[PDB]
Tab-separated table of N, CA, C and O in Angstrom:
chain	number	residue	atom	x	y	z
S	4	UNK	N	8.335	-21.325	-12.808
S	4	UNK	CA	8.951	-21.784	-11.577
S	4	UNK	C	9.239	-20.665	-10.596
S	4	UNK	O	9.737	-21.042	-9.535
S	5	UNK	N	9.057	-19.551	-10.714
S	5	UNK	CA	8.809	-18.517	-10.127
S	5	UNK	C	7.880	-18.570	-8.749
S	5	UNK	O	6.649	-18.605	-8.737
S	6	UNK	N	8.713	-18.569	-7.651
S	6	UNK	CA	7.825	-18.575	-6.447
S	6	UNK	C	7.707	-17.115	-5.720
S	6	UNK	O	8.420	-16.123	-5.562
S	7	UNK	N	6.487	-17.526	-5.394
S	7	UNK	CA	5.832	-16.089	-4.901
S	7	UNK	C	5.186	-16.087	-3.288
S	7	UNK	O	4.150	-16.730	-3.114
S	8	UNK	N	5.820	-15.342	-2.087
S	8	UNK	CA	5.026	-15.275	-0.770
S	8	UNK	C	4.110	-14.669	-0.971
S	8	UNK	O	4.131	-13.788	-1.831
S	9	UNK	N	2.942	-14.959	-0.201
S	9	UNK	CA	1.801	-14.265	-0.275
S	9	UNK	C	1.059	-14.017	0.905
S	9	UNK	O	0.513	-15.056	1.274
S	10	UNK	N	0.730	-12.672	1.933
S	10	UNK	CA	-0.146	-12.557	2.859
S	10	UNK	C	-1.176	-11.591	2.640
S	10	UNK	O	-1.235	-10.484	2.105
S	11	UNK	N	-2.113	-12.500	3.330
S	11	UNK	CA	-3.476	-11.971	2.356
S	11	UNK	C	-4.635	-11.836	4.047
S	11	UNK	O	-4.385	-12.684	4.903
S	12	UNK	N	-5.302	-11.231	4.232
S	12	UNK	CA	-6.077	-10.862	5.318
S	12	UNK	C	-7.491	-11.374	4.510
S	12	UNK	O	-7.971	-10.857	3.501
S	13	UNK	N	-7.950	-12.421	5.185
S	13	UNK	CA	-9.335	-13.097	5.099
S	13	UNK	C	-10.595	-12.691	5.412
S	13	UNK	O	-11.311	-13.459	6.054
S	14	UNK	N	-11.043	-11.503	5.039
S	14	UNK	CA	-12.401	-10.316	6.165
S	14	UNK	C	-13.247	-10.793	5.620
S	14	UNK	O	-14.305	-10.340	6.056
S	15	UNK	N	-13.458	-11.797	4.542
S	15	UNK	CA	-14.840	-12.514	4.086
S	15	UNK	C	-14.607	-13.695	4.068
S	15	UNK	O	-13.433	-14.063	4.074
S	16	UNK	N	-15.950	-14.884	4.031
S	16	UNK	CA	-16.321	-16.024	3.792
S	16	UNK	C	-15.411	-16.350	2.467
S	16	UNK	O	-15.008	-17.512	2.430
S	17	UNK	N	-15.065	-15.598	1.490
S	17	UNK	CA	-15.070	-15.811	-0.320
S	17	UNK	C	-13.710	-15.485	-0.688
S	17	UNK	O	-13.759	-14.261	-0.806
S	18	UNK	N	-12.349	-15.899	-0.977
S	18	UNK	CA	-11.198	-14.974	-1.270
S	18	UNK	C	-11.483	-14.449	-2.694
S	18	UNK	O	-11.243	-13.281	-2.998
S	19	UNK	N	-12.112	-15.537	-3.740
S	19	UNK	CA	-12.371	-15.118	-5.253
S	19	UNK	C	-11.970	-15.956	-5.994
S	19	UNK	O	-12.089	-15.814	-7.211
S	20	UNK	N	-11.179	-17.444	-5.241
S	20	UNK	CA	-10.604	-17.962	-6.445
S	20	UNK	C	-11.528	-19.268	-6.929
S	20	UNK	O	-12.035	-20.012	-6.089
S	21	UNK	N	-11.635	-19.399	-7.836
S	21	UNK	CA	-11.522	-20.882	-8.914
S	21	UNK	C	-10.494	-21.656	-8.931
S	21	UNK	O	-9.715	-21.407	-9.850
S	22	UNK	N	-10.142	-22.697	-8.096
S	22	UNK	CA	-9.100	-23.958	-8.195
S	22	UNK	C	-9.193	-24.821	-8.808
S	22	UNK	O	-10.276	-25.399	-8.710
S	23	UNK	N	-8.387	-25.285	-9.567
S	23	UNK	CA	-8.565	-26.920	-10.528
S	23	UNK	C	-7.208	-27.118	-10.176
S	23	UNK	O	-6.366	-26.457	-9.568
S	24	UNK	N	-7.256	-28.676	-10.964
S	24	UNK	CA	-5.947	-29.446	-10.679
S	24	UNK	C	-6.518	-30.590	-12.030
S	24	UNK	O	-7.649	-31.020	-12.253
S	25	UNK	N	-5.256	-30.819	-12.730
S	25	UNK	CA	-5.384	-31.875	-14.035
S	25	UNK	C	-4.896	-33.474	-13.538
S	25	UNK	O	-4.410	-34.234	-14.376
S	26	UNK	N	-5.045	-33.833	-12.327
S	26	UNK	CA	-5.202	-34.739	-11.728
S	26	UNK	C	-4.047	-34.924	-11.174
S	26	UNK	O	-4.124	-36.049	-10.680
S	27	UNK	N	-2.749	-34.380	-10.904
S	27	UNK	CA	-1.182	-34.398	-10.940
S	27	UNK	C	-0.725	-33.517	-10.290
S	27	UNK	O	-1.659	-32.717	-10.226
S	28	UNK	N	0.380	-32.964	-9.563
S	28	UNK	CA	1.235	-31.939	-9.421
S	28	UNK	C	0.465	-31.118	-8.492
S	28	UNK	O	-0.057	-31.662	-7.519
S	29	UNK	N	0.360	-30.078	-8.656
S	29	UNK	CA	0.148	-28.710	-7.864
S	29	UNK	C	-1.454	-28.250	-8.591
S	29	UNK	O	-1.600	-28.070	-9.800
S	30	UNK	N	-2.403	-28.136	-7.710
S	30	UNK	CA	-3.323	-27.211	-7.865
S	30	UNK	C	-3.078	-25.942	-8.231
S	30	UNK	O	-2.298	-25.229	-7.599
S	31	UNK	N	-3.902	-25.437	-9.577
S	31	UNK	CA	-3.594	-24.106	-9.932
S	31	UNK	C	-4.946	-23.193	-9.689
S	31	UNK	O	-6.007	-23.796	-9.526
S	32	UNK	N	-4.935	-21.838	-9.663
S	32	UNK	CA	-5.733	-20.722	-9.876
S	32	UNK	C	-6.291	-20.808	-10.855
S	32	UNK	O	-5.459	-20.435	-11.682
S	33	UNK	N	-7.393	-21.115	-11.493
S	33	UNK	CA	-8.010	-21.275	-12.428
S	33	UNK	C	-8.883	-19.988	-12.766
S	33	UNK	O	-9.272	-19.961	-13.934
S	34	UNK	N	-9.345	-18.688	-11.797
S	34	UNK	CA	-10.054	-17.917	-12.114
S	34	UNK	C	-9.919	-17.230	-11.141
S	34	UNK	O	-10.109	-17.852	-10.096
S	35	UNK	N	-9.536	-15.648	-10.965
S	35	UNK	CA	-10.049	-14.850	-9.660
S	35	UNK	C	-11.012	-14.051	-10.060
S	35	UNK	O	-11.495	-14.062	-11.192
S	36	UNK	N	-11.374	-13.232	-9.040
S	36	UNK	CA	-13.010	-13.025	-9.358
S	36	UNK	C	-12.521	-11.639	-9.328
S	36	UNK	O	-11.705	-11.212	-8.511
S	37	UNK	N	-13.107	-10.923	-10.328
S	37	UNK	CA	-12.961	-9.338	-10.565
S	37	UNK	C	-13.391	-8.684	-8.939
S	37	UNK	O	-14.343	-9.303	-8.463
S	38	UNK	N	-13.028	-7.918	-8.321
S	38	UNK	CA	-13.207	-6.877	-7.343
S	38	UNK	C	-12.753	-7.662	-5.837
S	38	UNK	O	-12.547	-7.109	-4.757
S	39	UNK	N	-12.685	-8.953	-6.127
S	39	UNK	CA	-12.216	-9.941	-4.690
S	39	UNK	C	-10.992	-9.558	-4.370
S	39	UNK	O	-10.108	-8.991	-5.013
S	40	UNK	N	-11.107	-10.186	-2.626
S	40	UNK	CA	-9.678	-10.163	-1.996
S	40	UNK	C	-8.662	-10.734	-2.800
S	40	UNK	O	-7.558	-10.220	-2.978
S	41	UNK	N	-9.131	-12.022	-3.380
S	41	UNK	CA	-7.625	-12.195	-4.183
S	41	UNK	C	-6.913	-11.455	-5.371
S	41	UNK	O	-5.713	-11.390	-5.638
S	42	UNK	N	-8.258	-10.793	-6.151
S	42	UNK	CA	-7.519	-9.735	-6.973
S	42	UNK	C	-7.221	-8.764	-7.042
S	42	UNK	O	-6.982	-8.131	-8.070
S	43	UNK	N	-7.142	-8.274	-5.509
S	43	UNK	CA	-6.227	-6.980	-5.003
S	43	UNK	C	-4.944	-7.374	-4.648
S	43	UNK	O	-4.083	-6.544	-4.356
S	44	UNK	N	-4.665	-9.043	-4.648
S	44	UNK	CA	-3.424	-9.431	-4.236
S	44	UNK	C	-2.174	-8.990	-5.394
S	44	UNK	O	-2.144	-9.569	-6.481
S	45	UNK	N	-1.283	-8.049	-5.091
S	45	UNK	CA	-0.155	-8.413	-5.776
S	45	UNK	C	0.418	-8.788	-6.665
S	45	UNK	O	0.454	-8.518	-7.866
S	46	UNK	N	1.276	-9.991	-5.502
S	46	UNK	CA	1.716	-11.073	-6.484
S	46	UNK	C	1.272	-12.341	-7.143
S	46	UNK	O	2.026	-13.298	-7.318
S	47	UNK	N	0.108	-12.309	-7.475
S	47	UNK	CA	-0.902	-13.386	-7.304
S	47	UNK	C	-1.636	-13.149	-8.451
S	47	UNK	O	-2.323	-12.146	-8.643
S	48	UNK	N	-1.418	-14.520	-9.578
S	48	UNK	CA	-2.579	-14.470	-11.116
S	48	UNK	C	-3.097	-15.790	-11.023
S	48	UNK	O	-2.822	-16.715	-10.260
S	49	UNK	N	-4.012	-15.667	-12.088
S	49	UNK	CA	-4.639	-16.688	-12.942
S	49	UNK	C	-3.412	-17.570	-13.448
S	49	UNK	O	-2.348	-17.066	-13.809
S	50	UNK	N	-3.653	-18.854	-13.439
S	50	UNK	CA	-2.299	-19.599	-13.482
S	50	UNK	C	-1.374	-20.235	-12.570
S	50	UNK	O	-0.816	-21.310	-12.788
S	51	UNK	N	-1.217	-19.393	-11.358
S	51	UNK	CA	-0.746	-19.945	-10.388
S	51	UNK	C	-0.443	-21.005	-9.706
S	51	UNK	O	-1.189	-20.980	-8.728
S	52	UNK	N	0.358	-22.113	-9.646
S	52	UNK	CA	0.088	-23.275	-8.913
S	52	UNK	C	0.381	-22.693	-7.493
S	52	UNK	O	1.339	-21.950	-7.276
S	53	UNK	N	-0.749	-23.191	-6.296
S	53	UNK	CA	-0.089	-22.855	-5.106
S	53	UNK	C	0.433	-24.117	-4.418
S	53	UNK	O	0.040	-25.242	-4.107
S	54	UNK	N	1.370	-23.454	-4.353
S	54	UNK	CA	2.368	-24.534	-3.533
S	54	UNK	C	2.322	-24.831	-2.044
S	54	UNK	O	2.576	-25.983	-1.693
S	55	UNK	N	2.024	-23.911	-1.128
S	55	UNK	CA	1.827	-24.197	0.045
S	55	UNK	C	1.090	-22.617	0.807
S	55	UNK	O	1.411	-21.431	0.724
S	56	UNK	N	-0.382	-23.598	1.780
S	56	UNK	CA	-0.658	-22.818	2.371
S	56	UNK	C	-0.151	-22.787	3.708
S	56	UNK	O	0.268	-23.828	4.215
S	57	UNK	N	-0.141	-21.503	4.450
S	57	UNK	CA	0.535	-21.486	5.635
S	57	UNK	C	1.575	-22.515	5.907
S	57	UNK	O	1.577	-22.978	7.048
S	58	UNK	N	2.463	-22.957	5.059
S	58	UNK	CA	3.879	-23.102	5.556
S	58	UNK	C	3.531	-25.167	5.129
S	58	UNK	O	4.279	-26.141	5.196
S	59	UNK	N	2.039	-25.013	4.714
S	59	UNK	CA	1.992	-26.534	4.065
S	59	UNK	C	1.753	-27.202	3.317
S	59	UNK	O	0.679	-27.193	2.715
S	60	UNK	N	2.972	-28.238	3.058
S	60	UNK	CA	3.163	-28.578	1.346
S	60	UNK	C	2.055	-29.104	0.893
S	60	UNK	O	1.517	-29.977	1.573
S	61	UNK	N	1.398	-28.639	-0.507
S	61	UNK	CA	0.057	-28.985	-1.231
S	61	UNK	C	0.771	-29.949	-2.384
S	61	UNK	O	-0.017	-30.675	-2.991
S	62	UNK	N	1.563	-29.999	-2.592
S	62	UNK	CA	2.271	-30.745	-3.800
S	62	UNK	C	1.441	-32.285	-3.972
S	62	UNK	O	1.437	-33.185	-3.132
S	63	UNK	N	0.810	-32.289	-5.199
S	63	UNK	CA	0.052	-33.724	-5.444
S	63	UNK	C	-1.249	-33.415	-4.811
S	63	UNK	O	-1.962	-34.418	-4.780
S	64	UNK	N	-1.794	-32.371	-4.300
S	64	UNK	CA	-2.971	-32.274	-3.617
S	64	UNK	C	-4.222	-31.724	-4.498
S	64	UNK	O	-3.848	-31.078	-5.477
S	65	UNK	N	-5.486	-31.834	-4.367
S	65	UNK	CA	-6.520	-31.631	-5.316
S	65	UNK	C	-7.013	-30.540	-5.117
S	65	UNK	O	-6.804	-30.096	-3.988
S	66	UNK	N	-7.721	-29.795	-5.928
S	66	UNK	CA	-7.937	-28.919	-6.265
S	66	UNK	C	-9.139	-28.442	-4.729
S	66	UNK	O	-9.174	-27.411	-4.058
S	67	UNK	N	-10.052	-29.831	-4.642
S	67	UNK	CA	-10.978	-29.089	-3.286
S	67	UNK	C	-10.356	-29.571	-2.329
S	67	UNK	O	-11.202	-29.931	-1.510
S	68	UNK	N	-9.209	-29.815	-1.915
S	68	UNK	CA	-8.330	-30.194	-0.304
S	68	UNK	C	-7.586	-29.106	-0.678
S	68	UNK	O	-7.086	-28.869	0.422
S	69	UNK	N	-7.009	-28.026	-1.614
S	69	UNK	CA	-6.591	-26.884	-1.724
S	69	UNK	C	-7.544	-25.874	-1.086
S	69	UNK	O	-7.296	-25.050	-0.206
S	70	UNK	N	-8.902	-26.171	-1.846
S	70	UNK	CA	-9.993	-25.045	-1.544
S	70	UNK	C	-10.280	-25.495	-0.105
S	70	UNK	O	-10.011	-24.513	0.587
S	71	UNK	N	-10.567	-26.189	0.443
S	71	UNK	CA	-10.492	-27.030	1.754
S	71	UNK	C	-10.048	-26.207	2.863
S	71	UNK	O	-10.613	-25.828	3.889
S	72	UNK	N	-9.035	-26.054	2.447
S	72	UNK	CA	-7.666	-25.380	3.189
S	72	UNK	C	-7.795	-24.209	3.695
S	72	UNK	O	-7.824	-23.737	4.832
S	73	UNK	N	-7.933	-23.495	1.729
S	73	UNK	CA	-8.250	-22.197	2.821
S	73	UNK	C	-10.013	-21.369	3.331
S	73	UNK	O	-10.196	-20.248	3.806
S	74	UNK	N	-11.016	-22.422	3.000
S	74	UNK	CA	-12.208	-22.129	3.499
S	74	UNK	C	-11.865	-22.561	4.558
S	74	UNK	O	-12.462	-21.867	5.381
S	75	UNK	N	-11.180	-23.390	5.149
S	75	UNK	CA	-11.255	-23.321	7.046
S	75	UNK	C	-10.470	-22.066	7.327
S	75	UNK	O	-10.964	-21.567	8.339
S	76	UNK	N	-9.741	-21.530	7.006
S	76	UNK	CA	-9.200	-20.657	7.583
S	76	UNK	C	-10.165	-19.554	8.430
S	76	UNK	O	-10.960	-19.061	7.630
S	77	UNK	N	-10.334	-19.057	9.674
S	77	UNK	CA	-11.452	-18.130	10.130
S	77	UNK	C	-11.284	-16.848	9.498
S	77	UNK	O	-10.280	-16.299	9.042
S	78	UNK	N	-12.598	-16.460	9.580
S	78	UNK	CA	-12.847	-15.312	9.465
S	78	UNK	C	-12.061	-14.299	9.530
S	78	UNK	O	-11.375	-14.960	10.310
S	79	UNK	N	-11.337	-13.039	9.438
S	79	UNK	CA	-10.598	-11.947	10.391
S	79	UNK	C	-9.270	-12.605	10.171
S	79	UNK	O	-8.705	-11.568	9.823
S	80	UNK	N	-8.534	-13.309	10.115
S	80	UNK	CA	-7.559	-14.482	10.182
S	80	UNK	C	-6.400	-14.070	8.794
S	80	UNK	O	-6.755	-14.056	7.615
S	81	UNK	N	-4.924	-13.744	9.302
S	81	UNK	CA	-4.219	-13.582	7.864
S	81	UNK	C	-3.850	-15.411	7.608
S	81	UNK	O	-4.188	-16.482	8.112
S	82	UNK	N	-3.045	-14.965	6.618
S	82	UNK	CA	-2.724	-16.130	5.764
S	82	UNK	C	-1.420	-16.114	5.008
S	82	UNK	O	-1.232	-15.034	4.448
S	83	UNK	N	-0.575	-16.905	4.854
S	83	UNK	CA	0.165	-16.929	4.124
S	83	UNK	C	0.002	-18.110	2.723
S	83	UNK	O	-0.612	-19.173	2.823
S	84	UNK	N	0.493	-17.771	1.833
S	84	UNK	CA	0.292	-18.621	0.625
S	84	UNK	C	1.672	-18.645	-0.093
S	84	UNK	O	2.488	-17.753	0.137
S	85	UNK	N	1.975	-19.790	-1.072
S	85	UNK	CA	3.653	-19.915	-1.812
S	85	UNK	C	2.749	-20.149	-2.809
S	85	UNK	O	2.027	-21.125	-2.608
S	86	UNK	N	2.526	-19.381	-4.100
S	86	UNK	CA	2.608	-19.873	-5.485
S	86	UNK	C	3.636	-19.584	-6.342
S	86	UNK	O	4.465	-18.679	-6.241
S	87	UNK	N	3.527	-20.387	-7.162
S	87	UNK	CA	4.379	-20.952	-8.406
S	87	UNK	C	4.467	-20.521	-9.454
S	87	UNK	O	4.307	-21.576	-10.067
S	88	UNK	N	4.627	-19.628	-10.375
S	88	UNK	CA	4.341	-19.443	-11.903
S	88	UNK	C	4.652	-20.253	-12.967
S	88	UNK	O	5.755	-20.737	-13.220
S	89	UNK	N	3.519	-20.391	-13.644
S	89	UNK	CA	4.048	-21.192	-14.374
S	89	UNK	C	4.821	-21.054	-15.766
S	89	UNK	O	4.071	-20.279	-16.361
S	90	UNK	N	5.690	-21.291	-16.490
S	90	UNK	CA	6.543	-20.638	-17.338
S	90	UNK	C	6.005	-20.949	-18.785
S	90	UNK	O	5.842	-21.790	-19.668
S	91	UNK	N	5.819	-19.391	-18.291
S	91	UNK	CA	4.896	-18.669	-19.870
S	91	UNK	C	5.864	-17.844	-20.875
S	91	UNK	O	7.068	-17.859	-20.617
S	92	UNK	N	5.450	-17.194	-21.898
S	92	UNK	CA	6.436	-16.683	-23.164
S	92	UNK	C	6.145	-15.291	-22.793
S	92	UNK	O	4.997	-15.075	-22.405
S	93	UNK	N	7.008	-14.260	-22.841
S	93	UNK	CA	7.168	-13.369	-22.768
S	93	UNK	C	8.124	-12.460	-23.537
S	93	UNK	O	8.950	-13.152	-24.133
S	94	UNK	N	8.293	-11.218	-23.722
S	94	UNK	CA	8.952	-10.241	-25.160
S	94	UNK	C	9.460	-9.029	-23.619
S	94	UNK	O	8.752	-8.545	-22.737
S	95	UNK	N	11.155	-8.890	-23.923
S	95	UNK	CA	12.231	-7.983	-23.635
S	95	UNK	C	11.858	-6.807	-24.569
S	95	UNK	O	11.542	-7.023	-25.739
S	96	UNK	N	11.895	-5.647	-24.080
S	96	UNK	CA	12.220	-4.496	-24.744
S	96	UNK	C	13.280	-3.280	-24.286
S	96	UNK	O	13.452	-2.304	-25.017
């Protein structure tokens, strides 16, 4: 449940990601692509549900009206993104 802002500068056709959705809820990140814009991002994994692009709610939305979204975005063009983490197991030391 971990939400995450995200601005990301669009200089290619391709950001890197793989989107799915299990027919319900929030579209997740299903794959970023080794050396892509999205996997120089940050705060930003495999797993991710994104919650809203540029400031709009995706909640219940499919995986290609996600991808949809941000292939219109132009060329040259930033972006903002809200993903979600999803709550995974992790070890304190």
């Amino acid at each position: 449940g971990t939400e995450k802002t995200v601005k990301v500068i669009k200089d290619g056709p391709a950001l890197g990601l793989t989107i799915s959705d299990n027919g319900a809820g929030y579209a997740f990140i299903k794959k970023i692509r080794e050396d892509s814009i999205m996997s120089r991002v940050a705060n930003v994994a495999v797993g991710d549900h994104i919650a809203k692009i540029n400031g709009t709610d995706l909640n219940g939305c499919r995986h290609f009206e996600v991808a949809r979204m941000l292939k219109e975005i132009p060329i040259g063009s930033e972006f903002t993104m809200i993903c979600v983490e999803p709550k995974k197991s992790s070890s304190e030391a």
